[PDB]
Design an enzyme around this catalytic site. Structure first.
Site, short mmCIF file in Angstrom:
data_model
loop_
_atom_site.label_atom_id
_atom_site.label_comp_id
_atom_site.label_asym_id
_atom_site.label_seq_id
_atom_site.Cartn_x
_atom_site.Cartn_y
_atom_site.Cartn_z
N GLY A 1 0.87 -1.15 0.00
CA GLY A 1 0.00 0.00 0.00
C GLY A 1 0.91 1.20 0.00
O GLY A 1 2.06 1.10 0.43
N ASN B 1 2.91 -0.53 10.01
CA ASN B 1 2.11 -1.74 10.13
C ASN B 1 2.17 -2.44 11.49
O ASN B 1 1.16 -2.97 11.96
CB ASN B 1 2.54 -2.76 9.07
CG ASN B 1 1.52 -2.95 7.98
OD1 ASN B 1 1.52 -3.97 7.30
ND2 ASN B 1 0.66 -1.96 7.79
N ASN C 1 1.42 -10.08 6.79
CA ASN C 1 0.21 -9.30 6.63
C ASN C 1 -0.08 -8.98 5.18
O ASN C 1 0.73 -8.34 4.50
CB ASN C 1 0.29 -8.00 7.44
CG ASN C 1 -0.97 -7.17 7.31
OD1 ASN C 1 -2.09 -7.71 7.33
ND2 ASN C 1 -0.81 -5.86 7.19
N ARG D 1 -0.65 9.89 6.53
CA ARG D 1 -0.38 8.82 5.58
C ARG D 1 -0.13 9.37 4.18
O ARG D 1 0.64 8.79 3.42
CB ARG D 1 -1.53 7.81 5.58
CG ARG D 1 -1.76 7.14 6.94
CD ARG D 1 -0.45 6.91 7.69
NE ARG D 1 0.50 6.11 6.93
CZ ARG D 1 1.77 5.91 7.28
NH1 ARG D 1 2.26 6.47 8.39
NH2 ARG D 1 2.56 5.16 6.53
N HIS E 1 -9.39 -4.77 6.73
CA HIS E 1 -8.20 -5.40 6.18
C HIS E 1 -7.03 -5.55 7.16
O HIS E 1 -6.35 -6.57 7.15
CB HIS E 1 -7.74 -4.66 4.93
CG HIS E 1 -6.72 -5.39 4.12
ND1 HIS E 1 -6.80 -6.75 3.88
CD2 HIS E 1 -5.62 -4.96 3.46
CE1 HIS E 1 -5.80 -7.11 3.09
NE2 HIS E 1 -5.07 -6.04 2.83
N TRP E 2 -6.79 -4.54 8.00
CA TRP E 2 -5.69 -4.63 8.96
C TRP E 2 -6.13 -5.03 10.36
O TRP E 2 -6.35 -4.20 11.24
CB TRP E 2 -4.89 -3.33 8.99
CG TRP E 2 -3.92 -3.22 7.85
CD1 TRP E 2 -3.59 -4.21 6.96
CD2 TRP E 2 -3.13 -2.08 7.48
NE1 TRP E 2 -2.66 -3.76 6.06
CE2 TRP E 2 -2.35 -2.45 6.36
CE3 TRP E 2 -3.01 -0.78 7.99
CZ2 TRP E 2 -1.46 -1.57 5.74
CZ3 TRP E 2 -2.13 0.10 7.38
CH2 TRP E 2 -1.36 -0.30 6.26
#
Lengths: 271, 271
Positions: free
Chosen positions: A33, A41, A100, A172, A250-251
């Protein structure tokens, strides 16, 4: 910048990584990403796991602050070579691996090519099977810089959108535009993107041969990788457990942090 | 006979039950099958959970050593009435409930009719949805006494058949022929048995209304209830987590005992 850690030559690439704790080695492999890094992460995971294990979290080549070699050829096999190079550089003969998403595909590939170097595996919303490309994934891999585009990506990743603040989108976004970041990222998964899902995947036949105790984790509402992909991994891998978190995107390590850390530590504690 | 515990009048039925530990109450509800009892089902679970909770494990009416009322009408609603009667008798105003198989269907039904009496739920290879009758289930409910028929049932329940010994088959066979046991059991789920799966189930609409934090557990190789049933429960219940144990049959608490106990205790510890 807390995302910048230690530096070491691995597989010929100057690598940025984090190394915390003592004892049984555990390699944490981040997802893909824009702006992603090992610290971004795993910042909420390392503190918990490092209390009982030696945690190593590197920035995979092409991501974070690891060198981006000129004319480098990003591939599943090259990334596996990087992981092994990192382990070799640190004299880590065998270790557990937590992969991941994108990193999950790499973990599977590493366990297949270097079975003796991998102990237990944790695969989260992992790549590894040939699932049909999702709009969420095409949005993530097709990202171009802007606070609004990043806000959309964070929305895609999160179950609870209240977590997506202007500050987070801004931070981000800034991470995504650091020198060379967008350039390498955009070159990694060009359209058609189904090709890369497939390239990161391992065959059913190969996956079935994995002897490792494995823990598959997936967020029910994952918009990037469908739950069906992890269910498939749960049927293919013999010594596998599948844990699906409801109200999770997703995470999983971020939205279900405490549950995730507890599950992973106990899983490794069994060994 | 360790299967015989304490006795109490509940919902007008003299009930056999076990009560160990102190603190937050947890009700364990056994599955269905010839000779099944609360002790047989939970003997390896009570010791672990009772260290942190007050564990109550009753023999549901029609099973074990609880009285078998003459002309009694076995039904989902009557069993729910029994559970509530047991809680009332013990002054348990609210409790977590662990429902195994048949007991899982009862747990869901109890949470729907008496939402305020149920806190967190753990549903194992649970009844609750209208899955198509399996040969495994028809064999269990259609059981007639014999060591060979019991050996077949144990094989159906187990992933690792090495656990199915002549001694175990003999002991369970003997449990199945105790006075009145086979008579009540055989009267419970007569052919066609799909009717009883459906009767024990709750509607999708109703299940979706459950506000309880829930932990769904299922053995990948479960031959009695298909994994698809628990996956369905995992999609219907909002605050749900699904944990699938590979290399595990119908009774997850027996074949994955330590993992099961750890998962359940931590789940309740969150509250």
């Amino acid at each position: 910048n807390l995302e910048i850690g230690k530096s070491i030559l691995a597989a010929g690439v100057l690598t940025n990584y984090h190394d915390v704790g003592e004892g049984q080695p555990v390699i944490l492999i981040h997802g893909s990403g824009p702006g992603v890094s090992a610290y971004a992460n795993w910042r909420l995971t390392i503190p918990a796991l490092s209390k009982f294990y030696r945690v190593i979290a590197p920035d995979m080549v092409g991501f974070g602050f690891t060198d981006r070699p000129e004319n480098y050829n990003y591939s599943k096999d090259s990334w596996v070579d990087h992981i092994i190079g990192i382990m070799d550089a640190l004299e880590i003969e065998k270790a557990h691996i937590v992969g991941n998403a994108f990193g999950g595909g790499l973990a599977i590939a590493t366990a297949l090519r270097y079975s003796e170097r991998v102990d237990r595996m944790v695969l989260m919303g992992a790549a590894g099977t040939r699932f049909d490309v999702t709009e969420g994934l095409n949005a993530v891999w097709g990202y171009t810089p802007s606070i609004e585009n990043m806000r959309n990506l964070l929305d895609i990743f999160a179950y609870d959108r209240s977590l997506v603040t202007d500050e987070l989108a801004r931070l981000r976004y800034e991470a995504s535009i650091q020198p060379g970041f967008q350039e390498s990222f955009s070159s990694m998964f060009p359209e058609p993107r189904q090709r890369w899902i497939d390239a990161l995947a391992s065959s059913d036949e190969d996956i079935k041969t994995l002897p490792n105790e494995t823990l598959i984790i997936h967020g029910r509402e994952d918009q990037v990788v469908p739950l069906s992909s992890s269910l498939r991994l749960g049927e293919l891998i013999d010594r596998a457990q599948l844990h699906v978190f409801g109200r999770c995107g997703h995470w999983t390590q971020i939205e279900q942090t405490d549950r995730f850390n507890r599950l992973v530590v106990e899983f490794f504690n069994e060994a």
